[PDB]
Amino acid sequence: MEMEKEFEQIDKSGSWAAIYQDIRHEASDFPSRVAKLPKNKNRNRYRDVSPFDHSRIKLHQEDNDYINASLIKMEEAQRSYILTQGPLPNTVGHFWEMVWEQKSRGVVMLNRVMEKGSLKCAQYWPQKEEKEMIFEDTNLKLTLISEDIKSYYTVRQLELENLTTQETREILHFHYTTWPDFGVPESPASFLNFLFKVRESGSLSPEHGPVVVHCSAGIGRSGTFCLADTCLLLMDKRKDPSSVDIKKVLLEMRKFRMGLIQTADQLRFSYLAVIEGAKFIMGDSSVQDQWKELSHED
Numbered sequence: 268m269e270m271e272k273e274f275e276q277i278d279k280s281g282s283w284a285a286i287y288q289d290i291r292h293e294a295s296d297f298p299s300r301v302a303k304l305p306k307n308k309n310r311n312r313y314r315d316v317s318p319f320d321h322s323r324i325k326l327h328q329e330d331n332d333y334i335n336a337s338l339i340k341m342e343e344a345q346r347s348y349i350l351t352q353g354p355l356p357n358t359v360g361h362f363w364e365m366v367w368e369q370k371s372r373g374v375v376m377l378n379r380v381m382e383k384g385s386l387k388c389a390q391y392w393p394q395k396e397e398k399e400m401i402f403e404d405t406n407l408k409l410t411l412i413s414e415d416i417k418s419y420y421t422v423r424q425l426e427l428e429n430l431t432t433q434e435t436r437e438i439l440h441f442h443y444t445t446w447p448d449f450g451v452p453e454s455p456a457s458f459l460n461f462l463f464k465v466r467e468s469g470s471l472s473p474e475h476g477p478v479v480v481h482c483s484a485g486i487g488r489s490g491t492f493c494l495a496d497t498c499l500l501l502m503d504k505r506k507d508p509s510s511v512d513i514k515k516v517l518l519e520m521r522k523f524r525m526g527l528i529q530t531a532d533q534l535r536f537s538y539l540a541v542i543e544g545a546k547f548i549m550g551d552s553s554v555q556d557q558w559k560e561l562s563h564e565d
């Protein structure tokens with residue numbers, strides 16, 4: 268079925284939980300043996316969220332190459348993403364090693380450091396220009412260059428230096444600050460405005476390594492971001508945009524990391540975002556300005 272009227276049909280029939288459970292039943296199951304080795308216990312934030320062996324990112328390090336991160340490679344859309352957990356106190360150095368080794372330009376952060384009164388990830392970037400960070404275990408230095416705080420999100424320019432070679436690179440940090448503690452946003456307008464800002468920066472393009480996207484576990488909000496991006500790219504590429512099947516795209520992405528999209532509410536929101544985004548893309552370009560306005564980012 269098409270998307271927007273499949274949507275109206277699930278809403279009127281109140282069957283989002285059943286649609287979502289079908290996806291959970293059909294999703295791939297692949298081994299994650301490296302993640303479960305005892306030496307890696309303090310490298311995993313959640314015991315039930317692990318990367319598959321076949322798609323895990325390997326650190327370039329002969330002692331222990333493990334990080335809880337997965338490469339999602341979308342063949343038709345010609346986009347790749349790295350999805351990862353929020354860094355832990357003992358993995359912040361590994362995180363920036365991965366960014367360096369995979370040649371990523373952008374990092375997309377969809378959570379706040381504290382939510383629901385508990386810590387959801389480590390403070391893994393510097394908050395003041397004059398107070399840079401040094402990661403001794405991986406020999407990297409990280410400096411804040413500039414910060415632009417808007418109503419729904421913040422963009423930071425960072426400098427990452429490999430202290431072994433004295434090479435330096437510019438990394439862009441895209442921080443969505445307004446996802447509610449419970450549930451999903453009422454309107455996808457600010458999330459789509461945010462996605463388009465990431466796109467406009469070059470961070471998702473083939474001349475760079477894959478963008479790194481994370482939330483707390485790296486499957487729920489993170490899954491919503493790449494599912495919406497990939498579906499919109501396919502609708503632009505194809506002769507028949509109504510042939511994009513969001514459930515089939517989601518199952519393809521779940522070949523590469525478990526558990527993407529964590530609730531039936533997140534699934535419904537993903538439909539909403541793709542539907543609204545397909546109107547602003549057209550051929551209607553003015554819709555982009557509309558989202559910006561409706562997002563009240565100032």
Ligand SMILES: O=C(O)COc1cccc(Cl)c1
Pocket residue numbers: 313315316483484485486487488529
């Ligand atoms: O389902 C659960 O309770 C555990 O898995 C997660 C933990 C934190 C965040 C997210 Cl999205 C999932």
